Design a protein around this nucleic acid. Structure first.
Lengths: 49, 52, 195, 207, 198, 175, 52, 171, 174
RNA sequence: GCUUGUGCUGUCUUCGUCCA
C-alpha cells in the first residue's frame, strides 16, 4: 500500500464529488491479483492475494 | 548392520517369517545371535489362519 | 584427581541413563474400555505462534497410523464460527477421535486449550466407537520431537504438499501414538534434547 | 511400559513459557514492560508474555504522595520484584519498591559455612573490588590569563623571586578545579598564597 | 616442465588436457570441486595415488575424496548464504531450556555460544527453533536504571570492565559485540546488571 | 554392540588363571562400588548368613555368562534372573526374595569386563619386562607389590621402580 | 584457589560461583554430587581455578 | 623462528585528545594495538623494542573529518613458523584423533595419520597418552615435531605438525 | 594490520617457483628476504634470533618498559602482567613459558660467546642467519642429526659442523 | 484487549520558460 490515506474512498473504490483532497491522498483505488505465497500455511483472513 | 542384513535376507526369502526357527534353518542368523534375539522378536499368531 | 573424575563421570553417566530411561518409558495413551497398548485415534490442533493472523490446522490420525482429513479453519478461534466448525468436524461420521491433543509455541495455546475443553464439555462430545459413554480427553502434548520432525527432510519428502504446522501436528499425533518410535526417528538429533 | 505421562502445572508452565518454576519464583527481580497505568493498579507484561500486576501500595514509595500517572508512563520498562506466581493462570504480582527491587541480591543459597567457605578471602577480595570501583579520572586545568602560570607553590615563589615587590602570579589551587590560588610578593623571600573560591562556573577550565 | 636439466626447465610445451593428471603435494590448501564434501577446504595429509586424504578446515576432521574433485585454492572464502535456516548472529533456541547465538556458520553445522559461555557444535536439524522475539521484549535495563536497547554501546564496571555494543537481549543476559575480543569474533555474554551505559 | 566394545581389545580370550583373576577383580570392584548396598543388605537381612558369598557367586556367574556365553544385558535380565536373586524361607515360612543385582549393575559388570583387559595387557607387559631383566634372585618387593597390584597406577609405580633400580639392564637391552 | 582470570571472571552469574571459595570438602562426599566436581574440573581446564 | 622487523602502523586520533599528552597516549594506544596481536603476513608480534621512545612524527588532518592520522614506525620482535621446519613443542591435550601441542602462542595439531603406528593411543592410561614400548608421550611431555602445513586465518594462525620422521617424537 | 617497509609489487605475467614459503629450500619470501631496508632506505640484512638472543631481548625490553612505567625505581608473571591486553598477557605468558622451558643459554655472556662463535667464524660467513638461528636453537648433537633436521646444511659441506656443535654443547650449561 | 501499514518505470516526440 501507499503512505497516503484511503478513508476518503467509497465502496466502489472511487472518491465522491465535494470532498477535500490533499497531496498524495488516494482518489482512485485499484488492485491487481497476485498468485498467493505459502501463506496457505494458515492465515484466516490476512493472506495477501 | 546385522538388522539391515536380516531385513534384506527376509526380503530375499519372501518378506514373511513363518517361524522363529527359520532364523536358523534358513541360515539367516548365527547360533549365538539367534540365541540372544529369539525371544525379543515375535510373530503375530492368528488362530483363524492356523487351524492346525 | 583422575580417580575422582572417573568415579564422578560414572555416577553422572548412570544418572543421565536413568533420566533418559524415565523420558522414553511411555506406553501409548490407553482409550477407556480398551486394553492397554491399543493405538488410539488422535486429533491434534495448533494455530502456531498464537498471533492475530495465525489459523488453526488440524490433523486426524486413526489407529492404523494413516493421516486422514487435514483441514484448515478460516475464522478467528475466539468466535462462535470456529466453535461451530470444530463441532461439525468432530461430530462428522468419518472421524472418531479417542483423544484431542493441543500444543503450541507460547501462552496463547492456553486459550485454545480452554476453548476446546469448554466446547467438548458443553456440547458433550463423546467417543464414537462406530452403553457407557465417555467424553474425549483434551491434554497438552510435549513437543520435544515434533519441533525437530517438522524440519526433517524425511517429513518433507513424506508430505511434500503440506506446510510446517501440518508436519508439527503430524509429529504431535505420532508422539501420542508411539513416543518410543518418535524418539527413534530423531536419529542423531536425540542427543541434543534436554535429558 | 508405564502409563502415558500427563503434564502437571509445572510441566505445562515450563512447556508454554520455557521458564522453569525454579528460575521464575518468589523474590526474583526481572525487567517488565509497563502496559497500563491507573490510580490504584498497574499492569505490565514480562519478557515471556506473563501478565503482571502491581498495586497502589507497591508502585509508590511511602514518602511519595504524587499520583501514579505522573510518575510512570505507558511503554516504559522498569525493574520489579516478584511477590507471587500463579503457575496455572500464568499471572504474577510484582512490587516496584526499593526495599524489594535492589536489596535482594544474594538470590542463591550458597553454603557460606565458615568451616566450608573462605569468608575472609571473600571479604578481602570484595573490599579490594570496592576499592577499585572508587577509582576516578582527573586532569590538569588550563586558564588563559596574562598573570596566570601553571606552576607549583615553590615554583611560583621562585618565579616571584626574580621580580620586584608587588608583582602578581596566578597558579592552580590544590583544593580542586573550583579554587584558584593567587600568589603575590609581600617582601623579598616572603610570599602570600590566597585561595579564591569560584562560583557559577561555566566549565572546569573556565573562570 | 621441471627436470634436473636447466635448459629443459626454460621450455614451454603445449600439451592436451586429456593426458594430464594433477599433482597434489602434502600440506597444500585445496578446495573440493564436486561431491558430498563440496566446498570443503583443508591441508593435504596423505596422497594414496588416486585417493587423497586431507584434514578439513570447517569440520576440522580428515576427509577422503578422490583427486579428481580437488582444486588447489590457498584460501577458503566460503560463503554460507543460502543455506540452513539461520543467518549469522541469530539467537537460536537449542532445546527446551537452552539458548545461544550463532558465532560461525558452516554448510552442515553451526557454532553456538551459550548464555553461560559454553560453545557447542550442532547440525542445523538438531536446533529446536529460532527465537523471533518482539522489539518490546528486546529491551533491558542497566545497573543504573537507564534503558538500554539493541545498538546501544555499554561498558562494564565489574570484572574485566570490557565494552561492547548490544547485539541481542535474552532475559537479563546481554550479547555484546566488541572489536578487541578476537576469541569469539567479538561476541561475549554478560548480564545487564554488570554494565553501565555510555 | 559386543563387537564394537571389543574392537579395541588386542586379545580378548584370556587363559584360565587370568580369567579367574578377572572374575575376582570384577567381584572386588563391585564390592568397592556397591558398599552402601552391601551394608543395607547385611543390616536389613541379618537373619540370613553369608549373603555376601551369594553376591560373589552371582557376580561370578554373570561374568561367566557375559565372557564365555556372550549374553547381552537384556537377555540375562529377562531369561537369567534366577542367578541375580536369592530366595529363602523365614521362621514363619515366609517366602522372601532378595534382589542382589539390577540391570545397571549388569551394565557395570560389562564395563568392568571391558576395563580389566587394559590392566591385563599392562600386567603382561610388566611381567615380560621383568623376564627380560632376568634377575638371579627374585625381588621380594617386586613380587609382593605385583601379586596385590590391582590398578594400572600401581603397575606404573612398579615399572618406575624396575626402570630405576635396574637401569643398567634396561640400558643394556636398549636417558 | 583462584588465578587472576578466576579472580576477575568468577561472577555471580557464572556456574563456577558455587565453589569459588570452597574449602574442607572431603573426597568421600564428592561422588554424591558429581556435577560439582566436574564443574570444578571444567573451571580448572579454563585456567580460572586450581584444585589442590 | 624469531626475527627483528621494521614495522609501521597507521593510527587515527580523535580531536578530543589533542592535548600535551598526545604523544604518550599514541604510544600506549600503539602498544595495546600491537603487543600480542597475530597477523598472518608476519606471524606473532611478541614485544616492541624501545617502546617508550618511538617517533610518531606529525599527524595529517583528514579533510572532512578533523581527525589526525599518524604514521608510527617501530622495530619489534616477530615469530613465524615455516613449512618444513623442525621445532620443539609441549603437548597440551590428548585426543583419539591426535594430540594438540603448544609452540608459544601457536597451537599445533598433529593427526594420527602423521604419527608412527607403534605410539598407540592409550585412553585408559592416567593421564591418557600415545605410548609405545620405549616411548610415552602425554600432557606436558617434551616433543620435537616438524611443521608440515600452516593455515592462515584473519587474525590467527593454525599449524600442522608431524612426528613420523627420524629424530622426532619424545625428547 | 601493520605494514612492512617493502611496498609496490604490482601485477605482472611471469610466475616464479621461489614464492612459496619453505624452510628446507631457504625460500623465506619477499618480506623475510636476505636483503632488507630500514626506515632510511639503507641496506640491511635479515636479522634472525635464537631462543637465547630472543629471550635476552624480550627480558631487556620488558624490564626497561616496567622500569620506565614505574618512574625509574625479575619475576616472569609480574613482568608479563606489566603489559596491557588480556590476550596480549596470555601470549607473552605463553612465550615466556616456552622460552623458559627451552632456554639453552640463560646467561648474557654465554649468549654473547655463542653469537660471536656463530658469526665471526670463517665457515659461518657463508651460513644463512636462519641456519645459525636453527643451530643455536634446536641444540643438535650430531652432524647427521643436524642435516636431517636442517636440509639446507646438507649442501654446505665446507662447514666444520661437528666441532661447532661440540663447542655449543660445551657452552651449554648442563 | 486492542494496536498503522512504509514507495516508482524507461525511451522518444512535441510544445513552452529565462538568458543568449
Amino acid at each position: 500500500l501507499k503512505h497516503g490515506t484511503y478513508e476518503k474512498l467509497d465502496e466502489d473504490g472511487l472518491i465522491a464529488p465535494g470532498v477535500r483532497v490533499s497531496g498524495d491522498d488516494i482518489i482512485i483505488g485499484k488492485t491487481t491479483p497476485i498468485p498467493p505465497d505459502t501463506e496457505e500455511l494458515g492465515q484466516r483472513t490476512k493472506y495477501h492475494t | 548392520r546385522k538388522a539391515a542384513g536380516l531385513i534384506q535376507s527376509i526380503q530375499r526369502i519372501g518378506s514373511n517369517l513363518v517361524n522363529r526357527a527359520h532364523l536358523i534353518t534358513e541360515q539367516l542368523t548365527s547360533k549365538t545371535v539367534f540365541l540372544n534375539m529369539a525371544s525379543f522378536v515375535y510373530i503375530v499368531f492368528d488362530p483363524d489362519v492356523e487351524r492346525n | 584427581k583422575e580417580s575422582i573424575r572417573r568415579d564422578c563421570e560414572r555416577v553422572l553417566y548412570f544418572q543421565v541413563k536413568n533420566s533418559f530411561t524415565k523420558k522414553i518409558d511411555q506406553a501409548p495413551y490407553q482409550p477407556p474400555t480398551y486394553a492397554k497398548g491399543t493405538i488410539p485415534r488422535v486429533l491434534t490442533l495448533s494455530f502456531g505462534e498464537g498471533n492475530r493472523g495465525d489459523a488453526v490446522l488440524g490433523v486426524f490420525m486413526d489407529d492404523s497410523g494413516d493421516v486422514k482429513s487435514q483441514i484448515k479453519f478460516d475464522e478467528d478461534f475466539q468466535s462462535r464460527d470456529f466453535s461451530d466448525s470444530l463441532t461439525r468436524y468432530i461430530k462428522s461420521n468419518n472421524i472418531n477421535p479417542d483423544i484431542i491433543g493441543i500444543s503450541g509455541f507460547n501462552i496463547h495455546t492456553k486459550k485454545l486449550f480452554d476453548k476446546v475443553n469448554e466446547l467438548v464439555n458443553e456440547e458433550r462430545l463423546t467417543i464414537e466407537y462406530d452403553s457407557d459413554k465417555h467424553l474425549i480427553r483434551v491434554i497438552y502434548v510435549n513437543d520435544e520431537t515434533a519441533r525437530l520432525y517438522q524440519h526433517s527432510s524425511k517429513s518433507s519428502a513424506e508430505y511434500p504438499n503440506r506446510p510446517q504446522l501440518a508436519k508439527y501436528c503430524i509429529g504431535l499425533a505420532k508422539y501420542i501414538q508411539s513416543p518410543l518410535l518418535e524418539y527413534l526417528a530423531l536419529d542423531e538429533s536425540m542427543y541434543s534434547l534436554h535429558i | 511400559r508405564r502409563d502415558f505421562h500427563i503434564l502437571n502445572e509445572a510441566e505445562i508452565f515450563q512447556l508454554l513459557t520455557r521458564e522453569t518454576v525454579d528460575s521464575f519464583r518468589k523474590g526474583m527481580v526481572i525487567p517488565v514492560y509497563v502496559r497500563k497505568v491507573e490510580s490504584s493498579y498497574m499492569s505490565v507484561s514480562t519478557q515471556s508474555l506473563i501478565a503482571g500486576n502491581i498495586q497502589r501500595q507497591d508502585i509508590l514509595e511511602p514518602n511519595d504522595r504524587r499520583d501514579p500517572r505522573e510518575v510512570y508512563s505507558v511503554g516504559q520498562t522498569v525493574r520489579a520484584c516478584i511477590l507471587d506466581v500463579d503457575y496455572y493462570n500464568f499471572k504474577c504480582q510484582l512490587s516496584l519498591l526499593r526495599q524489594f527491587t535492589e536489596n535482594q541480591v544474594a538470590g542463591l543459597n550458597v553454603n557460606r559455612n565458615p568451616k566450608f567457605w573462605d569468608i575472609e578471602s571473600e571479604n578481602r577480595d570484595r573490599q579490594e573490588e570496592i576499592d577499585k570501583q572508587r577509582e576516578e579520572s582527573r586532569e590538569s586545568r588550563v586558564i588563559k590569563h596574562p598573570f596566570f602560570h601553571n606552576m607549583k607553590s615553590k615554583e611560583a615563589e621562585d618565579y616571584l623571586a626574580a621580580r620586584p615587590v608587588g608583582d602578581v602570579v596566578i597558579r592552580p589551587s590544590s583544593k580542586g578545579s573550583n579554587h584558584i590560588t593567587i600568589s603575590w610578593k609581600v617582601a623579598p623571600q616572603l610570599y602570600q598564597h590566597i585561595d579564591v573560591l569560584e562560583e557559577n562556573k561555566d566549565d572546569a577550565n573556565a573562570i | 616442465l621441471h627436470s634436473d636439466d636447466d635448459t629443459i626447465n626454460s621450455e614451454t610445451v603445449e600439451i592436451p588436457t586429456s593426458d594430464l593428471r594433477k599433482i597434489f603435494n602434502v600440506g597444500d590448501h585445496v578446495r573440493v570441486i564436486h561431491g558430498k564434501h563440496t566446498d570443503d577446504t583443508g591441508l593435504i595429509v596423505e596422497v594414496n595415488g588416486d585417493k587423497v586424504e586431507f584434514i578439513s578446515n570447517q569440520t576440522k576432521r580428515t576427509v577422503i575424496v578422490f583427486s579428481n574433485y580437488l582444486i588447489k585454492s590457498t584460501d577458503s572464502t566460503v560463503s554460507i548464504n543460502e543455506s540452513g535456516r539461520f543467518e549469522l548472529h541469530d539467537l537460536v533456541q537449542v532445546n527446551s531450556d537452552l539458548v545461544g547465538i550463532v558465532i560461525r556458520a558452516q554448510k552442515d553445522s553451526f557454532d553456538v555460544l551459550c548464555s553461560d559461555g559454553k560453545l557447542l557444535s550442532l547440525p542445523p536439524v538438531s536446533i529446536y527453533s529460532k527465537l523471533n522475539l518482539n522489539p518490546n521484549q528486546q529491551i533491558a535495563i542497566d545497573s543504573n536504571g537507564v534503558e538500554v536497547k539493541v545498538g546501544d554501546t555499554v561498558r562494564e564496571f565489574t570484572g574485566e570492565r570490557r565494552q561492547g555494543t548490544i547485539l541481542h537481549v535474552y532475559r537479563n543476559f546481554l550479547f555484546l559485540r566488541s572489536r578487541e575480543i578476537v576469541e569469539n569474533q567479538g561476541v561475549f555474554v554478560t548480564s545487564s546488571n554488570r554494565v553501565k551505559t555510555i | 554392540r559386543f563387537q564394537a566394545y571389543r574392537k579395541s581389545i588386542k586379545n580378548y580370550k584370556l587363559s584360565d588363571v587370568d580369567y579367574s583373576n578377572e572374575r575376582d577383580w570384577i567381584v572386588e570392584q563391585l564390592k568397592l562400588e556397591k558398599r552402601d548396598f552391601l551394608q543395607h543388605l547385611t543390616q536389613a537381612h541379618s537373619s540370613v548368613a553369608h549373603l555376601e558369598e551369594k553376591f560373589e557367586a552371582s557376580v561370578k556367574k554373570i561374568v561367566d555368562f557375559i565372557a564365555i556365553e556372550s549374553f547381552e544385558v537384556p537377555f540375562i535380565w529377562n531369561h537369567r534372573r534366577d542367578y541375580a536373586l536369592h530366595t529363602y524361607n523365614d521362621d514363619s515360612n515366609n517366602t522372601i526374595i532378595v534382589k542382589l543385582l539390577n540391570e545397571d549393575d549388569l551394565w557395570r559388570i560389562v564395563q568392568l569386563d571391558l576395563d580389566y583387559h587394559s590392566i591385563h595387557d599392562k600386567k603382561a607387559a610388566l611381567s615380560s619386562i621383568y623376564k627380560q631383566l632376568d634377575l638371579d634372585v627374585v625381588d621380594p618387593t617386586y613380587e609382593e607389590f605385583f601379586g596385590s597390584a590391582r590398578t594400572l597406577s600401581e603397575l606404573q609405580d612398579i615399572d618406575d621402580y624396575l626402570t630405576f633400580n635396574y637401569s643398567s639392564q634396561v640400558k643394556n637391552l636398549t636417558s | 584457589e583462584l588465578t587472576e582470570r578466576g579472580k576477575l571472571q568468577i561472577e555471580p552469574e557464572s556456574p563456577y560461583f558455587d565453589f569459588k571459595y570452597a574449602k574442607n570438602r572431603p573426597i568421600s562426599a564428592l561422588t554424591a554430587t558429581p556435577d560439582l566436581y566436574l564443574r570444578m574440573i571444567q573451571a580448572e581446564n579454563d585456567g580460572l581455578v586450581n584444585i589442590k | 623462528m624469531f626475527f627483528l622487523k621494521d614495522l609501521s602502523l597507521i593510527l587515527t586520533l580523535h580531536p578530543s585528545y589533542f592535548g600535551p599528552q598526545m604523544n604518550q597516549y599514541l604510544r600506549e594506544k600503539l602498544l595495546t594495538d600491537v603487543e600480542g596481536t597475530c597477523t598472518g603476513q608476519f606471524g606473532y608480534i611478541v614485544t616492541v623494542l624501545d617502546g617508550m621512545n618511538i617517533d610518531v612524527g606529525k599527524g595529517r588532518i583528514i579533510p572532512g573529518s578533523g581527525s589526525a592520522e599518524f604514521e608510527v614506525k617501530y622495530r619489534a620482535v616477530v615469530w613465524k613458523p615455516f613449512k618444513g621446519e623442525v621445532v620443539d613443542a609441549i603437548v597440551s591435550n590428548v585426543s583419539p584423533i591426535g594430540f594438540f601441542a603448544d609452540v608459544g602462542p601457536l597451537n599445533v595439531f598433529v593427526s594420527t595419520r602423521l604419527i608412527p603406528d607403534n605410539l598407540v593411543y592409550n585412553p585408559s592410561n592416567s593421564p591418557p597418552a600415545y605410548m609405545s614400548n620405549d616411548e610415552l608421550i602425554t600432557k606436558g611431555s617434551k616433543v620435537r615435531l616438524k611443521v608440515v602445513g600452516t593455515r592462515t586465518d584473519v587474525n590467527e594462525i593454525y599449524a600442522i605438525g608431524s612426528i613420523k620422521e627420524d629424530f622426532l617424537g619424545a625428547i | 594490520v601493520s605494514t612492512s617497509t617493502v611496498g609496490a609489487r604490482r601485477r605482472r605475467a611471469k610466475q616464479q617457483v621461489d614464492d612459496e614459503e619453505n624452510a628446507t629450500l631457504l625460500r623465506l619470501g619477499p618480506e623475510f628476504a636476505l636483503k632488507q631496508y630500514d626506515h632510511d632506505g639503507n641496506e640491511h640484512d635479515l636479522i634472525a634470533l635464537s631462543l637465547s638472543e630472543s629471550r635476552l631481548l624480550i627480558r631487556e625490553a620488558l624490564k626497561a618498559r616496567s622500569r620506565a612505567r614505574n618512574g625509574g625505581v625479575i619475576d616472569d608473571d609480574e613482568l608479563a602482567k606489566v603489559t596491557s591486553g588480556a590476550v596480549a598477557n596470555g601470549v607473552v605468558k605463553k612465550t615466556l613459558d616456552y622460552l623458559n622451558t627451552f632456554a639453552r643459554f640463560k646467561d648474557e655472556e654465554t649468549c654473547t660467546a655463542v653469537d660471536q662463535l656463530l658469526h665471526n667464524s670463517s665457515d659461518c660467513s657463508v651460513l644463512h642467519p636462519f641456519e645459525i638461528a636453527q643451530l643455536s636453537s634446536l641444540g643438535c648433537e650430531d652432524v647427521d642429526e643436524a642435516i636431517t633436521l636442517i636440509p639446507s646444511l646438507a649442501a654446505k659441506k665446507e662447514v666444520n659442523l661437528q666441532r661447532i656443535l661440540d663447542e655449543l654443547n660445551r657452552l651449554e650449561d648442563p
